[PDB]
Amino acid sequence: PEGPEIRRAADNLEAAIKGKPLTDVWFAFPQLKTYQSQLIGQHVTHVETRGKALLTHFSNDLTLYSHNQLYGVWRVVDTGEEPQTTRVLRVKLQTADKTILLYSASDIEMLRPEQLTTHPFLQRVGPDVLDPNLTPEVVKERLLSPRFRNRQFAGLLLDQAFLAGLGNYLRVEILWQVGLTGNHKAKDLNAAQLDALAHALLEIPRFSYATRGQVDENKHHGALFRFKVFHRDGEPCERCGSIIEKTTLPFYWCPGCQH
Numbered sequence: 001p002e003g004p005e006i007r008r009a010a011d012n013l014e015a016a017i018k019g020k021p022l023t024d025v026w027f028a029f030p031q032l033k034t035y036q037s038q039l040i041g042q043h044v045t046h047v048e049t050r051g052k053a054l055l056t057h058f059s060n061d062l063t064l065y066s067h068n069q070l071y072g073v074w075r076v077v078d079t080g081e082e083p084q085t086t087r088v089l090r091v092k093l094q095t096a097d098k099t100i101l102l103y104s105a106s107d108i109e110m111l112r113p114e115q116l117t118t119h120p121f122l123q124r125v126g127p128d129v130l131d132p133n134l135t136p137e138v139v140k141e142r143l144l145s146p147r148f149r150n151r152q153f154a155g156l157l158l159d160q161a162f163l164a165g166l167g168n169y170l171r172v173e174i175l176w177q178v179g180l181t182g183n184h185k186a187k188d189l190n191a192a193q194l195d196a197l198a199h200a201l202l203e204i205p206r207f208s209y210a211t212r213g214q215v216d217e218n219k220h221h222g223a224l225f226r227f228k229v230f231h232r233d234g235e236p237c238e239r240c241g242s243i244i245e246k247t248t249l250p251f252y253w254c255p256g257c258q259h
């Protein structure tokens with residue numbers, strides 16, 4: 001989607017003030033002033049990435065949404081420090097030692113939990129599977145949410161609105177892992193299957209990412225992560241021996257042990 005770049009900024013912010021009691025909170029926008037005193041003593045629980053946007057979660061359930069767009073930039077300084085940048089300050093989240101400042105950005109809003117689901121931008125891009133904060137429990141929730149619970153996995157696993165960081169190659173491996181064909185929906189699964197699928201949606205993408213070697217390394221060394229059905233059409237399933245199939249109207253799957 002954008003690589004570490006997007007997740008990099010979120011991590012910088014977390015490292016600086018995650019879990020630390022806020023000693024001062026300031027917002028430039030008039031409609032945001034009302035949340036200032038309310039946040040004193042609270043802390044950022046985590047920073048979620050959503051496309052090129054950041055969702056700064058607070059322990060009181062409020063969430064600060066920010067999209068740098070063209071000029072926004074977050075800076076971490078020592079509490080008390082006053083940068084000499086001419087950029088306009090929009091947000092200041094201060095803790096005892098570290099302070100993070102958002103300059104120039106215009107897309108800044110405070111959201112309650114129920115507003116996250118209805119936010120235009122957020123509806124278009126879901127959480128990233130490589131985000132350490134994204135947990136299987138959160139995944140099962142999205143799968144069961146009225147918005148997705150009735151979508152076929154074949155298309156859902158290719159839709160960034162559900163989860164970002166997925167691709168066809170990951171989609172087919174994930175479904176093979178839980179023995180499902182692309183026509184199923186989260187609403188028809190039992191608790192066991194749902195949990196199984198929720199873990200696979202994260203484990204497989206992370207396993208593939210963490211172990212990919214350099215370019216052309218495959219010429220002398222096979223990767224730790226091996227595809228089971230992707231590009232293996234015509235080969236036997238390692239589980240049941242059936243011949244892996246590929247569609248033509250690509251979904252790869254074992255018709256022998258996936259249904």
Ligand SMILES: [Mg+2]
Pocket residue numbers: 220221
């Ligand atoms: Mg080597």
Ligand SMILES: [Mg+2]
Pocket residue numbers: 180181184259
């Ligand atoms: Mg079935």
Ligand SMILES: [Zn+2]
Pocket residue numbers: 237238239240241242254255256257258
């Ligand atoms: Zn099989």
